[PDB]
Design a binder for this molecule. Structure first.
Ligand SMILES: C[C@H](N[C@H](C(=O)O)[C@@H]1CCCN1C(=O)c1ccc(C(=O)O)cc1)C(=O)N1CCC[C@H]1C(=O)O
Ligand SMILES: *[C@@H]1O[C@H](CO[C@@H]2O[C@@H](C)[C@@H](O)[C@@H](O)[C@@H]2O)[C@@H](O)[C@H](O)[C@H]1NC(C)=O
Ligand SMILES: CC(=O)N[C@@H]1[C@@H](O)[C@H](O)[C@@H](CO)O[C@H]1O
Ligand SMILES: CC(=O)N[C@@H]1[C@@H](O)[C@H](O)[C@@H](CO)O[C@H]1O
Ligand SMILES: *[C@@H]1O[C@H](CO)[C@@H](O)[C@H](O)[C@H]1NC(C)=O
Ligand SMILES: *[C@@H]1O[C@H](CO)[C@@H](O)[C@H](O)[C@H]1NC(C)=O
Ligand SMILES: [Cl-]
Ligand SMILES: [Zn+2]
Length: 603
């Protein structure tokens, strides 16, 4: 580690800790910059060489964390809990948690290489018998094929190709991660991840929110199951069991918008999926991003800077190079460079993802003046909610009409139910998977889920929460969790469950602040400068204040609350109950052990 990046002398009291924190944050910018730069170079161009480079940057980061976290331990380990400035307490708390820097060199190197190699296996896996990659080929199959056998072939081929080889690596990663966080005083990695919410009743509150949301999911599930039954027959669909996991329009069954054209109740009304309009008008990736940007600027938030347009990767490179195609947002920590890396396809749900990633960028633009350690969302759920809120407005039929993507819709109940149902497929169907992924990973970190039970515990939670089953037999050689991006990429997941609830609370508050007075699901905050000022206050805070206070200021309440969500979907919730009652559906899947048979002559 460059001497210039090592800590100097500081007094062992609050005033010395303020100086300590300023010199920490100053040198941390350069180290963060070189790390994110090496990751960028790798993720947009996966090679052994770029992997070695990102591992070197990781090692430097770890030496930095060690030098500074040990100094904080030496100076402030006694007293930092007594510091009367709450923000300093937080900055210093964070510095004295060293994470992987608690590891010796040889372990550091093995942790870093584990992360590289897991990343490479996920993003370079392919399904053969020419070869299909996850994005766009398998994604497009899952989304649009209505052939049971072709859907099974992609689902099984992806899970085998990604999950199987990941499993030995994931086990080693888990043990090293846990050894690292345990020396900071956490029971395991999961406990460190949960600490970000600064909330003694975190797990209980989540459980409580889930209980309010579950009836909405169960009604949605049974209505969808009924449509799949008409489309695949009694042999492949059990009206009282879990739904086969490959039939819901997405590799993970994590949101169901892609099968809207199979379940829309009034398919003679104007199609609320504008994909084919975007293709007929000639939309490209760049127009997607420019349309998202203009929404943000209509709110008087910032435009994307030049460095964003010059640096971002907005489409999959044609030049025979391996990339991480999963969409992501990037802050280089230099207050200048911010980019998105997305293999953008022209579809309406991609337009959604574009707003999602740009919400991350906007956050970065809004807090780039803060000292580095405050450059985070108020909690990780806030960072995930920002672009989702704008996408709630963008998706509304009125707004799509404003942007030339739909010829105005008559404002009838049929149009309303069509729209709310499509929104339910996107948001409500996600809720169980958002909740369950970290329940799985917290169990693995805690040791409750050893490697000999990774797949058993995974499908337990998949069936418990989503009510799906694997369409082929799985065993413990399979590692189905590892075929989901965020697992080999070690990105925590509970943020997304938090987000999908928080976004409705934000939306409600923003619509009120824009003076809108219609049904909440028909609000569009476009061009509202007062909504934009209330949003801006959140983004500019970063993590400088507890999320519970930030939320109080914004929404009038200091806790997550499912009510705004329930209010947004109220009409479809009622309609769905009525449909299911009329059809005599059983809610849930009392036939928990059922699996579909294989198709004849598979494969
Ligand atoms: C496509 C969307 N992609 C993710 C994302 O944006 O979240 C990507 C990959 C995981 C993290 N991520 C970031 O881009 C990101 C970058 C930085 C930070 C930070 O500064 O802390 C946070 C996130 C997503 O997975 N999603 C969207 C909602 C559901 C979830 C999924 O598809 O499984
Ligand atoms: C749409 O109409 C609303 C009043 O009508 C109610 O909702 C519509 C969708 C019909 O289903 C009708 O039977 C309902 O009673 C107004 O509140 C609303 O502001 C209108 N929205 C817009 C944007 O025009
Ligand atoms: C190791 C490797 O393949 N990298 C090459 C490098 O040698 C070359 O000079 C430059 C431009 O092609 O980048 C690429
Ligand atoms: C039936 C219904 O929900 N109507 C509402 C009404 O409450 C509101 O005051 C008005 C404002 O646009 O239109 C809408
Ligand atoms: C990808 O990085 C490697 C270095 O390993 C090299 O082939 C080349 O510089 C890069 N390709 C592009 C297009 O940047
Ligand atoms: C798991 O399933 C595959 C394919 O059905 C099979 O080849 C393999 O034997 C299994 N692993 C174990 C331990 O059975
Ligand atoms: Cl999180
Ligand atoms: Zn995100």
């Amino acid at each position: 580690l460059d001497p210039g990046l090592q800590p100097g002398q500081f007094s062992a009291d609050e005033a010395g800790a303020q100086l300590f924190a300023q010199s920490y944050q100053s040198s941390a910018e350069q180290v963060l910059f070189q790390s994110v730069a090496a990751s960028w170079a790798h993720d947009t161009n996966i090679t052994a060489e770029n992997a070695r480079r990102q591992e070197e940057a990781a090692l430097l980061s770890q030496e930095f964390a060690e030098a500074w976290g040990q100094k904080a331990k030496e100076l402030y380990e006694p007293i930092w809990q007594q510091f009367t400035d709450p923000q300093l307490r937080r900055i210093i708390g964070a510095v004295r948690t060293l994470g992987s820097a608690n590891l010796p060199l040889a372990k550091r190197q093995q942790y870093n290489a584990l992360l590289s190699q897991m990343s490479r296996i996920y993003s370079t896996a392919k399904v053969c018998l020419t070869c299909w990659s996850l994005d766009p080929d398998l994604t497009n199959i899952l989304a649009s094929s209505r052939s049971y056998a072709m859907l099974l072939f992609a689902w099984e081929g992806w899970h085998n190709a990604a999950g199987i080889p990941l499993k030995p690596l994931y086990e080693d990663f888990t043990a090293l991660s846990n050894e690292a966080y345990k020396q900071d005083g956490f029971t395991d990695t999961g406990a460190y991840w949960r600490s970000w919410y600064n909330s003694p009743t975190f797990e209980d509150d989540l459980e409580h929110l889930y209980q309010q949301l579950e009836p909405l999911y169960l009604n949605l599930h049974a209505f969808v199951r009924r449509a799949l039954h008409r489309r695949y027959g009694d042999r492949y669909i059990n009206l009282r069991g879990p739904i086969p996991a490959h039939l819901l329009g997405d590799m993970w069954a994590q949101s169901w918008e892609n099968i809207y054209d199979m379940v829309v109740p009034f398919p003679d009304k104007p199609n609320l999926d504008v994909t084919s309009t975007m293709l007929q008008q000639g939309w490209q990736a760049t127009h997607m991003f420019r349309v998202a940007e203009e929404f943000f600027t209509s709110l008087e938030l910032s435009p994307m800077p030049p460095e964003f347009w010059e640096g971002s990767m907005l489409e999959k490179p044609a030049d025979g190079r391996e990339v991480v195609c999963h969409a992501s947002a990037w802050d280089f920590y230099n207050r200048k460079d911010f980019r998105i890396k997305q293999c953008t396809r022209v579809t309406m749900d991609q337009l959604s993802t574009v707003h999602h990633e740009m919400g991350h960028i906007q956050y970065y633009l809004q807090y780039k003046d803060l000292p580095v350690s405050l450059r985070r969302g108020a909690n990780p759920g806030f960072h995930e909610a920002i672009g989702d809120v704008l996408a709630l407005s963008v998706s509304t039929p009125e707004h799509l009409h404003k942007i030339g993507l739909l010829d105005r819709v008559t404002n009838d109940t049929e149009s309303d139910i069509n729209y709310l149902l499509k929104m339910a497929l996107e948001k409500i169907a996600f809720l169980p998977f958002g909740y369950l992924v970290d329940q799985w990973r917290w169990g693995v970190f805690s040791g409750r889920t050893p490697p000999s039970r990774y797949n058993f515990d995974w499908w337990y939670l998949r069936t418990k929460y989503q009510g799906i089953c694997p369409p082929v037999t799985r065993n413990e050689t399979h590692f189905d969790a590892g075929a989901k991006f965020h697992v080999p990429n070690v990105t925590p997941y509970i943020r997304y469950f938090v987000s999908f609830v928080l976004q409705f609370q934000f939306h409600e508050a923003l619509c009120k602040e824009a003076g809108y007075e219609g049904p909440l699901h028909q609000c569009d905050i476009y061009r509202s400068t007062k909504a934009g000022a209330k949003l801006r206050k959140v983004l500019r805070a970063g993590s400088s204040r507890p999320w519970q206070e930030v939320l109080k200021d914004m929404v009038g309440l200091d806790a997550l609350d499912a009510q705004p969500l329930l209010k947004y979907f109220q009409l479809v919730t009622q309609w769905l109950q009525e449909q299911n009652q009329q059809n005599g559906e059983v809610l849930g899947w009392p036939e928990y052990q059922w699996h579909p048979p294989l198709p004849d002559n598979y494969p």
